[PDB]
Design a protein around this ligand. Structure first.
Ligand SMILES: Nc1ncnc2c1ncn2[C@@H]1O[C@H](COP(=O)(O)OP(=O)(O)OP(=O)(O)O)[C@@H](O)[C@H]1O
Ligand SMILES: [Mg+2]
Ligand SMILES: [Zn+2]
Ligand SMILES: [Zn+2]
Ligand SMILES: [Zn+2]
Lengths: 259, 257, 591
């Protein structure tokens, strides 16, 4: 099992496959067939269905979303290669659960929820243009044009500071266009005023939509957003590596439900 | 001598540079013309009578007497213009202890719509009508600031928080350059009657520095010869606006001839 | 000295394609195209993507996948091809423009995964910035070691050399830019938005910035709809980045025979029946306006506007208006806004707007400072957005004097010459204008002249083809019928409409009819002459006098009516019906 959890990849995948096949309001197979013709590789699943079918699986999914969702993705892809074994898709199916834990008391949120899937209802206040974030930086030497690549350098990009063919001093500059990017859209969403008992200070959250699900919510739209709670450090000065002892927190959206 | 590898590079060479300088200085004495009146002596005397530091040189004379030199003038305008300026200054000092040389009579005249990147950073003569003119602006200085606590130099800033480290220090001037030590800006558009009806008349901006300042008035049709080159402008990094550095100006009498 | 095998192979194959590929005639078409390119102002050469794909499918696939990577090598190949062929200037910029790309993506579909690859998009220009030279391959000299750094390419930002050229010297901070040696290229920043066709209902459109260079700099003017073939790229902005579509080629978005061949068999049969359908005039009017009662003349005029006359340009470079302008002056309510809303909803290219709009454009092109760039930009207005379409302007009586004069100039010269803040442009605007207005004081005084009833200036009134007066009649039958219509509509939520022709059918029929340019027969000429004789003889009292402007409006309406049946020549029927319409639109003082 993955460290510090109760998760087995094979057993978890088998349980998810059983849930997909053995269920009663089968809708998942119907929408799998629908995706076949549509080609839309995103299998939306209501987590409450998993809760009713298997509370243990629902708890496991909530506790460790980042580690469990890939298993569900693999199971769905294997099923899609079982039913309709022949078909063409640019990327294999993906699963985006939703409507799992209505801890919509955003004002009442705890660090215990870090890295746990949560759904919150609210009205989006602001958005931003899709931001292209690097994932495989490309570099070329000013001297000899020695091409090189640095892949997924944990957010930042590791400047080589030294070439590899002329082995000159730091002269290899990044080429933006030759690099590889992914879409990341930032949204600022306010807590739903109705749900707040007191509402003395309406709460706001920051959401990031990655690689997809971008521009799917216009400003002012009241939606239920389900995603992984995230806390990240903030550096006191970009030059120095020191970080604040208090983390700023945001949400990595997994699914949107217009409502 | 000639036939190098690049005209700009060839003139930049010290050997050929001084060769052309000496040849031009000698021509400043030899060219008495068929009249035999020592045309250059007459020009020097006229300039020193009022001390105008403004010399007029006819492209036809240079082309006929030298040929190759006049041929290289269009491709390397600034270099040969500086050579001629220093030669004229030396001659004036010798006869009468800076001199600006203004060329004219360019064989080919191009309209504003007729000039393109092929003519960038070259001397050319055009015919236009002035539309607007400003005062004698003092100077345009580009200031680059060495960052405070970061290995970086702030971008050029025009005059007349670090992008990477976000340093709040005032920074210190890494390098300051002066351009147009005293200049007037004018705008010249295609002369009325040469426009193709529907087409909006073309317009270009000319800068007259030191010499030729206030030598034109708005609404005057002028045959302007100058270097059509890119350069900074009063506006992250400053915008590079193409302009004409005015080398010589004239007046078309009666506005129709 | 690192050689990109992909780049070199692509360059070789591209040069081979240029110097071998030939048209159906068996000759290298691109040879003659380049021969044309030798002329000044011609520094961009177009290339058919399908042609090179047929020549080498692998080459086309590679270029599509890595267009941005290989583009400079394609330009070098073009330079080599043109230099050795003919007497072309030894050194001037050249470019390659690609077209005929089957894949037409939507601005929504432009994702980071598409960065660096060729693609074609379709949009509508919104604002256009001034041209500006920009350094692409800068040249610097190190101050300490006075060595000339050359070809230090800059990625759309002021990128100085990382360190000196000399290994001995490490100034790293005092490089001096060599302006003369630096390579510059002319860039224009344009902004485009999703065309209404692709725009989802009630969804904010996606604004995409594009860069135009070389022959494409002035190709696209503000307010027009165009298709750009290029490649999406990233540009650093004060590791932040933003998307911009560097467009190599710009073309206008998308003959009667061509349409009929393209049109489906069933659609063409329906259109042919429509043309052969007698009384199609009233039938189409009623079908297009179900939720209306009476005002048959207003619907007739609106339909004639929708069709439009034949524009003509004289040998003296004078443009004779081909489209018509309609104004509807009406008492409170009376469905004016309903007329405009119906017209906007039915017809694509039709834009609805109000005279109370506070946009900086102000219902026409304007010049505004960009909030970020702070440089004056020509922003297209709604009237421009209606280019070659219809502009349904409501509250026309309430327009500002600034917009009023702008609109007067637009409708007079069919183009707007905007000059301010040093920027200057001449934006073409051939747009039919359907205006709605209210009488002064609210109610139309039929005993007063039209001038006394509306505040519009004399030039605006004179330049309108038709004025339709909607007076709230006190007749009981009319009010009963109006109530019947409204109540039937609201109760029978749908199915209350009786459309003898479907909206899509009407749209396709209008598109087919537009292809015709009816001519005037000598019989039609003399009939028009006689009709104008009668109209002049009327000389009354009429609200507004009758001038040659009315004769021009008459001939334009006759052309539109001829276009109705798709007949290529005018007949006395069309002229007499147009005369009836225009004469009826005239209202005499009832004092
Ligand atoms: N002659 C008519 N026949 C049918 N319906 C009519 C007629 N006149 C008015 N109506 C109805 O009146 C309703 C309200 O009118 P509407 O709001 O469109 O007026 P309007 O033209 O915008 O008025 P105004 O601009 O003078 O304020 C419309 O839904 C339309 O159905
Ligand atoms: Mg209204
Ligand atoms: Zn190297
Ligand atoms: Zn710094
Ligand atoms: Zn150095």
């Amino acid at each position: 099992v993955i460290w510090g959890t109760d998760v087995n990849v094979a057993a978890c995948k088998e349980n998810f496959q059983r849930f997909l096949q053995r269920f009663i309001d089968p809708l998942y197979m119907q929408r799998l067939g629908e995706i076949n013709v549509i080609g839309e590789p995103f299998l939306n699943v209501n987590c409450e269905h998993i809760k009713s079918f298997d509370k243990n699986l629902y708890r496991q999914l909530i506790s460790y979303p980042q580690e469990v969702i890939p298993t569900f993705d693999m199971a769905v892809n294997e099923i899609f290669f079982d039913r309709y074994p022949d078909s063409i898709l640019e990327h294999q199916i993906q699963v985006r659960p939703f409507n799992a834990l209505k801890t919509k008391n955003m004002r009442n949120l705890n660090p215990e929820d870090i890295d746990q899937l949560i759904t919150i209802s609210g009205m989006v206040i602001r958005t931003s243009q899709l931001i292209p974030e690097m994932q495989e930086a490309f570099f070329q030497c000013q001297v000899c044009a020695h091409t090189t690549r640095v892949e997924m350098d944990r957010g930042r990009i590791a400047e080589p500071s030294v070439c590899g063919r002329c082995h000159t001093t730091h002269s290899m500059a990044l080429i933006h266009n030759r690099s590889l990017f992914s879409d990341k859209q930032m949204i600022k969403l306010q807590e739903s005023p109705e749900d707040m008992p007191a509402g003395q200070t309406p709460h706001t959250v920051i959401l990031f939509a990655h690689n997809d699900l971008v521009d799917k919510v216009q400003p002012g739209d009241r939606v239920n957003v389900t995603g992984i709670y995230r806390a990240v450090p903030i550096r006191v000065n970009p030059r120095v590596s020191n970080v604040k002892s208090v983390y700023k927190t945001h949400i990595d959206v997994i699914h949107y439900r217009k409502t | 001598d000639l036939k190098g590898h690049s005209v700009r590079e060839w003139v930049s060479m010290a050997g050929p540079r001084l060769e052309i300088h000496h040849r031009f200085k000698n021509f400043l004495r030899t060219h008495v013309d068929s009249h035999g009146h020592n045309v250059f002596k007459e020009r020097i005397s006229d300039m020193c009578k009022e001390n105008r530091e403004s010399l007029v040189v006819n492209y036809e004379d240079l082309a006929a007497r030298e040929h190759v030199l006049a041929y290289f003038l269009p491709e390397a305008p600034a270099e040969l213009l500086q050579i001629f300026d220093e030669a004229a200054l030396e001659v004036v000092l010798a006869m009468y202890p800076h001199i600006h040389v203004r060329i004219s009579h360019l064989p080919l005249v191009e309209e504003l719509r007729s000039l393109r990147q092929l003519h960038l950073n070259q001397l050319i003569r055009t015919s236009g009508v002035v539309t607007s003119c400003t005062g004698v602006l003092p100077q345009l200085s580009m200031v680059k600031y060495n960052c405070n606590k970061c290995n970086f130099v702030l971008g050029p800033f025009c005059q007349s928080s670090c992008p990477e480290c976000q340093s709040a220090g005032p920074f210190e001037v890494n390098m300051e350059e002066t351009i147009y030590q005293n200049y007037q800006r004018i705008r010249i558009q295609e002369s009325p009657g040469k426009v193709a009806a529907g087409r909006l008349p073309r317009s270009k901006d000319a800068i007259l520095l030191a010499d030729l300042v206030d030598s034109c008035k708005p609404g005057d049709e002028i045959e302007l010869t100058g270097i059509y080159h890119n350069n900074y402008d009063g506006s992250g990094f400053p915008v590079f606006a193409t302009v004409i550095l005015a080398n010589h100006v004239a007046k078309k009498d009666n506005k129709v001839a | 000295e690192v050689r990109d095998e992909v780049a070199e192979k692509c360059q070789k194959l591209f040069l081979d394609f240029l110097e071998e590929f030939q048209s159906s005639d068996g000759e290298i078409k691109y040879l003659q195209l380049a021969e044309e390119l030798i002329r000044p102002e011609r520094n961009t050469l177009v290339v058919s993507f399908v042609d090179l794909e047929q020549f080498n499918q692998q080459l086309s696939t590679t270029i599509q996948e890595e267009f941005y990577r290989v583009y400079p090598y394609l330009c070098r190949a073009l330079k080599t091809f043109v230099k050795d062929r003919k007497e072309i200037p030894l050194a001037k910029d050249f470019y390659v423009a690609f077209q005929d790309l089957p894949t037409r993506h939507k601005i929504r579909e432009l994702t980071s995964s598409r960065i660096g690859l060729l693609t074609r998009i379709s949009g509508q220009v919104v604002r256009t910035h001034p041209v500006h030279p920009e350094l692409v391959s800068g040249t610097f000299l190190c101050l300490d070691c006075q060595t000339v750094i050359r070809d230090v390419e800059q990625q759309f930002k002021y990128t100085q050399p990382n360190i000196c050229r000399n290994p001995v010297c490490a100034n790293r901070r005092r490089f001096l830019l060599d302006t003369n040696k630096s390579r510059f290229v002319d860039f224009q920043k344009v902004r485009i938005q999703e065309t209404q066709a692709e725009l989802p209902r009630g969804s904010i459109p996606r604004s995409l910035e594009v860069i135009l260079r070389a022959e494409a700099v002035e190709s696209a003017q503000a307010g027009d709809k165009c298709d750009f073939t290029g490649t999406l790229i990233v540009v650093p902005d004060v590791l932040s980045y933003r998307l911009v579509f560097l467009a190599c080629c710009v073309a206008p978005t998308n003959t009667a025979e061509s349409i009929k061949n393209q049109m489906t068999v069933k659609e063409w049969e329906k259109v042919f029946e429509m043309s052969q359908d007698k009384n199609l005039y009233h039938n189409l009017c009623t079908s297009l306006f179900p939720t209306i009662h009476g005002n048959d003349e207003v619907k007739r005029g609106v339909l004639l506007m929708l069709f439009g006359g034949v524009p003509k340009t004289t040998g003296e470079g004078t443009s004779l208006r081909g489209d018509i302008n309609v104004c509807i002056v009406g008492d409170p309510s009376t469905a004016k806004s309903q007329f405009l809303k119906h017209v906007e909803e039915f017809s694509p290219r039709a834009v609805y707007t109000s005279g109370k709009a506070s946009s900086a454009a102000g219902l026409t092109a304007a010049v505004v400072r960009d909030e970020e760039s702070h440089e004056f930009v020509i922003e297209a207005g709604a009237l421009m957005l209606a280019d070659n379409g219809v502009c349904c302007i409501d509250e026309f009586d309430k327009m500002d004097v600034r917009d009023q004069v702008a609109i007067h100039e637009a409708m007079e010269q069919q183009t707007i010459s905007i000059t301010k803040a040093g920027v200057k442009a001449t934006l073409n605007a051939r747009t039919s204008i359907l205006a709605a207005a209210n009488p002064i004081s609210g109610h139309y005084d039929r005993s007063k002249s039209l001038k006394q009833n509306i505040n519009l200036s004399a030039p605006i009134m004179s330049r309108f083809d038709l004025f339709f007066i909607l007076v709230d009649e006190c007749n009981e039958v009319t009010d009963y019928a109006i109530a019947r219509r409204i109540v039937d509509l609201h109760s029978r939520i749908e199915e209350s409409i009786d459309r003898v022709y479907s909206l899509d059918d009407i749209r396709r029929y209008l598109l087919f009819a537009r292809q015709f340019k009816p001519k005037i027969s000598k019989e039609s000429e003399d009939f028009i002459v006689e009709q104008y004789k009668h109209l002049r003889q009327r000389d009354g009292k009429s609200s507004w006098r009758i001038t040659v402007r009315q004769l021009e409006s008459m001939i334009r309406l006759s052309e539109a009516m001829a276009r109705m049946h798709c007949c290529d020549e005018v007949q006395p029927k069309h002229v007499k019906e147009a005369f009836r319409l225009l004469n009826k639109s005239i209202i005499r003082v009832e004092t």
